[PDB]
Motif scaffolding. Sequence first.
Motif, PDB file in Angstrom:
ATOM      1  N   UNK A   1       0.844  -1.241   0.025  1.00  0.00           N
ATOM      2  CA  UNK A   1       0.033  -0.007  -0.066  1.00  0.00           C
ATOM      3  C   UNK A   1       0.822   1.266  -0.010  1.00  0.00           C
ATOM      4  N   UNK A   2       1.887   1.452   1.025  1.00  0.00           N
ATOM      5  CA  UNK A   2       2.719   2.282   1.050  1.00  0.00           C
ATOM      6  C   UNK A   2       3.367   2.759  -0.402  1.00  0.00           C
ATOM      7  N   UNK A   3       3.905   1.666  -0.850  1.00  0.00           N
ATOM      8  CA  UNK A   3       4.632   1.760  -2.109  1.00  0.00           C
ATOM      9  C   UNK A   3       3.935   2.199  -3.407  1.00  0.00           C
ATOM     10  N   UNK A   4       2.555   1.778  -3.475  1.00  0.00           N
ATOM     11  CA  UNK A   4       1.834   2.391  -4.521  1.00  0.00           C
ATOM     12  C   UNK A   4       1.683   3.663  -4.517  1.00  0.00           C
ATOM     13  N   UNK A   5       1.008   4.134  -3.339  1.00  0.00           N
ATOM     14  CA  UNK A   5       0.855   5.548  -3.076  1.00  0.00           C
ATOM     15  C   UNK A   5       2.197   6.577  -3.286  1.00  0.00           C
TER      16      UNK A   5
ATOM     17  N   UNK B   1       0.171  -0.115 -10.347  1.00  0.00           N
ATOM     18  CA  UNK B   1       1.198  -0.301 -11.225  1.00  0.00           C
ATOM     19  C   UNK B   1       2.331  -1.242 -10.346  1.00  0.00           C
ATOM     20  N   UNK B   2       2.113  -2.698 -11.020  1.00  0.00           N
ATOM     21  CA  UNK B   2       3.152  -3.509 -10.481  1.00  0.00           C
ATOM     22  C   UNK B   2       4.497  -3.199 -10.796  1.00  0.00           C
ATOM     23  N   UNK B   3       4.853  -2.366 -11.542  1.00  0.00           N
ATOM     24  CA  UNK B   3       6.223  -1.950 -11.687  1.00  0.00           C
ATOM     25  C   UNK B   3       7.156  -1.153 -10.671  1.00  0.00           C
ATOM     26  N   UNK B   4       6.535  -1.133  -9.529  1.00  0.00           N
ATOM     27  CA  UNK B   4       7.223  -0.147  -8.593  1.00  0.00           C
ATOM     28  C   UNK B   4       8.206  -1.120  -7.827  1.00  0.00           C
TER      29      UNK B   4
ATOM     30  N   UNK C   1       1.862  -9.914  -8.877  1.00  0.00           N
ATOM     31  CA  UNK C   1       0.896 -10.819  -9.720  1.00  0.00           C
ATOM     32  C   UNK C   1      -0.546 -10.306  -9.251  1.00  0.00           C
ATOM     33  N   UNK C   2      -0.835  -9.884  -7.932  1.00  0.00           N
ATOM     34  CA  UNK C   2      -2.132  -9.540  -7.733  1.00  0.00           C
ATOM     35  C   UNK C   2      -2.818  -8.039  -8.061  1.00  0.00           C
ATOM     36  N   UNK C   3      -1.653  -7.295  -8.146  1.00  0.00           N
ATOM     37  CA  UNK C   3      -1.944  -5.827  -8.427  1.00  0.00           C
ATOM     38  C   UNK C   3      -2.084  -5.512  -9.858  1.00  0.00           C
TER      39      UNK C   3
ATOM     40  N   UNK D   1       3.648   9.147 -16.295  1.00  0.00           N
ATOM     41  CA  UNK D   1       4.634   8.355 -15.647  1.00  0.00           C
ATOM     42  C   UNK D   1       6.159   8.914 -15.635  1.00  0.00           C
ATOM     43  N   UNK D   2       6.403   9.589 -16.826  1.00  0.00           N
ATOM     44  CA  UNK D   2       7.626  10.220 -16.949  1.00  0.00           C
ATOM     45  C   UNK D   2       7.609  11.620 -15.952  1.00  0.00           C
ATOM     46  N   UNK D   3       6.230  12.214 -16.028  1.00  0.00           N
ATOM     47  CA  UNK D   3       6.038  13.570 -15.225  1.00  0.00           C
ATOM     48  C   UNK D   3       6.748  13.392 -13.809  1.00  0.00           C
ATOM     49  N   UNK D   4       5.819  12.244 -12.991  1.00  0.00           N
ATOM     50  CA  UNK D   4       6.314  11.684 -11.881  1.00  0.00           C
ATOM     51  C   UNK D   4       7.812  11.546 -11.598  1.00  0.00           C
ATOM     52  N   UNK D   5       8.573  10.810 -12.504  1.00  0.00           N
ATOM     53  CA  UNK D   5       9.758  10.467 -12.507  1.00  0.00           C
ATOM     54  C   UNK D   5      10.810  11.704 -12.703  1.00  0.00           C
ATOM     55  N   UNK D   6      10.308  12.573 -13.662  1.00  0.00           N
ATOM     56  CA  UNK D   6      11.017  13.867 -13.975  1.00  0.00           C
ATOM     57  C   UNK D   6      10.911  15.042 -12.855  1.00  0.00           C
ATOM     58  N   UNK D   7      10.068  14.635 -12.241  1.00  0.00           N
ATOM     59  CA  UNK D   7       9.812  15.421 -10.683  1.00  0.00           C
ATOM     60  C   UNK D   7      10.455  15.064  -9.555  1.00  0.00           C
ATOM     61  N   UNK D   8      10.661  13.602  -9.681  1.00  0.00           N
ATOM     62  CA  UNK D   8      11.613  12.991  -8.355  1.00  0.00           C
ATOM     63  C   UNK D   8      12.941  13.338  -8.706  1.00  0.00           C
ATOM     64  N   UNK D   9      13.619  13.434  -9.920  1.00  0.00           N
ATOM     65  CA  UNK D   9      14.809  14.032 -10.379  1.00  0.00           C
ATOM     66  C   UNK D   9      14.880  15.407  -9.936  1.00  0.00           C
TER      67      UNK D   9
END
Length: 239
Positions: free
Chosen positions: A80-84, A159-162, A169-171, A208-216
Amino acid sequence: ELQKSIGKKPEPTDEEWELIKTVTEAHVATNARKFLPEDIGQVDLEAFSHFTKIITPAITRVVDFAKKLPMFCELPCEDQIILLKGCCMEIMSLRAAVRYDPESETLTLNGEMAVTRGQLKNGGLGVVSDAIFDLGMSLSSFNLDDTEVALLQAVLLMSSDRPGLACVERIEKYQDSFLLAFEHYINYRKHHVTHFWPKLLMKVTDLRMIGACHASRFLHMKVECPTELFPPLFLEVFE
Ligand SMILES: Oc1ccc(Oc2c(Br)cc(CC(O)O)cc2Br)cc1C(O)NCCc1ccccc1
């Protein structure tokens, strides 16, 4: 998929109409003007200040949406933490982008504050501004309702990619359920623009890019502006 070979273009199952009932209610519950003077932005430390005065409520509303979805609540606690943490900014950029208006060329942040592309940019976001704007410009034309934004959001959430997720599998499976109830809901809306759904899935990539590009971007800020300047929830969710 055979329905897909015939080009039948189905509308949602009854079971699916449930999922759409929930994400739209969860979303409308948490989706919420005042023009911030051309004075601010025109790093600007005053633009900085005004945008972080209001981000702590924005983040909680993005959490409050995830709380309202029951598939999310079926997940272990560290997952839960990780998705949010992942979609927080992704969800947030969309929520703003769809509140573009081309008369003024402003987004509406937190559902109150109305910023131009330079104002959002100068408070520390850099191109992350241009990304959120370019996006809102394109979605002008798509004409999304509360339910589509809701589902797009629910796709981003699941997004199970996190990194470090345990229940992949379940996500993934949950996500395919939103995507399926979503595509059927598009079919049902009959939008006048060929390949609407392919076009819409590429908005997931851009968010998805924006999020990333914001973390950088947030690492470039940590360097110059110390951690003390940042609302404690923002820090807990982006560190
Ligand atoms: O970080 C941010 C995130 C969202 C943001 O605007 C918002 C805000 Br506030 C809220 C939302 C959700 C909503 O509109 O309800 C979307 C968006 Br887009 C502004 C900044 C901002 O100006 N902060 C700058 C300090 C900083 C933080 C991270 C990276 C670089 C600089």
